Design an enzyme around this catalytic site. Structure first.
Site, PDB file in Angstrom:
ATOM      1  N   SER A 145      -0.685   3.562  -3.930  1.00 42.10           N
ATOM      2  CA  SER A 145      -1.479   3.568  -2.788  1.00 42.10           C
ATOM      3  C   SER A 145      -2.846   3.263  -3.278  1.00 42.10           C
ATOM      4  CB  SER A 145      -0.941   4.625  -1.747  1.00 42.10           C
ATOM      5  OG  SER A 145       0.037   4.537  -1.129  1.00 42.10           O
ATOM      6  N   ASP A 243       3.627  -3.900   3.660  1.00 41.35           N
ATOM      7  CA  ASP A 243       3.533  -2.623   3.351  1.00 41.35           C
ATOM      8  C   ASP A 243       2.920  -1.663   4.503  1.00 41.35           C
ATOM      9  OD1 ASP A 243       2.415  -0.547   0.907  1.00 41.35           O
ATOM     10  OD2 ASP A 243       1.246  -0.519   2.568  1.00 41.35           O
ATOM     11  N   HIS A 292       6.403   2.202   1.797  1.00 43.00           N
ATOM     12  CA  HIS A 292       5.092   2.649   1.191  1.00 43.00           C
ATOM     13  C   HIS A 292       5.276   3.432   0.127  1.00 43.00           C
ATOM     14  CE1 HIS A 292       1.110   4.796   1.411  1.00 43.00           C
ATOM     15  NE2 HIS A 292       0.746   3.586   1.313  1.00 43.00           N
TER      16      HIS A 292
END
Ligand code: T2E
Ligand code: NAG
Length: 346
Positions: A145, A243, A292
């Site tokens: 991330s 995502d 994610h």
């Protein structure tokens, strides 16, 4: 378990002035080193950073960090959980700078918070060279991330740092997980938040990308498809095509289950655009799933593209850096809707 070490240079700090640090588990029979960057958004002004300090303080301070962490996924030392790099030296670098790992600004009479992400990475590398990194053959800088975007922003600076310190034999490489975002039109913004953030953080971007976009436009280098062609170090890109954080910033919420034409076309177009940006990325893994992050989750071995798992793709990448028969490195789904790949996480 990886054991916490707070940085000996206590001027390199988390947001609130407490020392930054890293968690380490050595593997003395190995010359491979994995340094993983934690993720989790960012904050870009006094008001929203103050809110983050109330209810996300472990991302702004080391005062409450535990003495140990269990390694999971690519940070696990068990071959059953980590077929790729189970025997490597393992490092977890907590994210406590709220600046997508770009900042170089200390707390002062004019600054309520310190934003030192880019300097934290450099100081971790320096102190590790005394703990065995001086003998490494490969340093893989990985992250998820915001930490995946941080890989893209910092991988070539780590390579330059080690060159200048006199270690031209260590091969620096990058692994960016869930940090490849699009500055697309919203369904109903990151570019403005990042622009304000860079000024608030004194943020720094890779030099070749900075020279292309120039003053005031450094925010472009936070977007993978724009910064990746400027990088010299090898970088493997892991990115879900749908995502969940991309959909959040696009103001999309898949809830109640009845998708009409406008949203159907929007989601299909997002998948096609991100496939397009990866077409000329030779080392990549991009499944057609709504999810994610992946690389430090324990079941990261389960998802496959065209019959090849992510641990296998990363091993094939290692072999390519010595096409390979039956051992691919570029793996991007072509089907156009989330979970059209049956191996997607449930
Ligand atoms: N909801 C959400 C949205 C974005 C995230 N990444 C930060 C980022 C955004 C845009 C460009 N580069 C990096 C994250 C996270 O770090 O988990 C969570
Ligand atoms: C400590 O870190 C700061 C910030 O990077 C740097 O300016 C300073 O030289 C470091 N101190 C030592 C002794 O390396």
């Amino acid at each position: 378990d990886l054991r916490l070490h707070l940085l000996l240079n206590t001027s390199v700090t988390c947001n609130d002035g407490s020392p930054a640090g890293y968690y380490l588990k050595e593997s003395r029979g190995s010359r491979r080193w994995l340094l993983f960057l934690e993720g989790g958004w960012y904050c870009f002004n006094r008001e929203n950073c103050d809110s983050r300090y109330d209810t996300m303080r472990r991302l702004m301070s080391s005062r409450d960090w535990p003495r140990t962490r269990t390694g999971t996924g690519i940070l696990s030392s068990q071959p059953e959980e980590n077929p790729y790099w189970w025997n490597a030296n393992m490092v977890f670098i907590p994210y406590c700078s709220s600046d997508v790992w770009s900042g170089a600004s200390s707390k002062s009479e004019k600054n309520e918070y310190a934003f030192m992400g880019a300097l934290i990475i450099q100081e971790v590398v320096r102190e590790l060279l005394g703990r065995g990194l001086s003998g490494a053959k490969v340093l893989l800088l990985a992250g998820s991330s915001a930490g995946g975007t941080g890989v893209l922003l910092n991988v070539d600076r780590v390579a330059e740092q080690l060159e200048k310190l006199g270690y031209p034999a260590i091969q620096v490489r990058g692994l960016a997980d869930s940090g490849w975002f699009l500055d697309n039109k919203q369904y109903r913004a990151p570019t403005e938040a990042i622009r304000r953030g860079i000024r608030y953080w004194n943020g720094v971007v890779p030099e070749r990308c900075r020279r292309q976009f120039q003053e005031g436009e450094e925010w472009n280098c936070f977007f993978g498809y724009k910064v990746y062609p400027t990088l010299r170090s090898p970088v493997f890109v892991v990115q879900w095509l749908f995502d969940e954080a991309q959909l959040t910033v696009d103001n999309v919420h898949l809830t109640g289950q009845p998708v009409q034409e406008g949203l159907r076309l929007y989601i299909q177009n997002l998948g096609r655009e991100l496939r397009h940006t990866l077409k000329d990325v030779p080392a990549s893994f991009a499944p057609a799933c709504l999810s994610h992050e992946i690389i430090i989750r324990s079941h990261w071995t389960d998802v496959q593209v065209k019959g090849t798992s992510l641990p296998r793709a990363l091993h094939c990448w290692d072999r390519s850096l010595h096409p390979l028969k039956g051992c691919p490195v570029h793996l991007v789904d072509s089907c156009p809707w989330p979970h059209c790949n049956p191996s997607c996480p449930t």
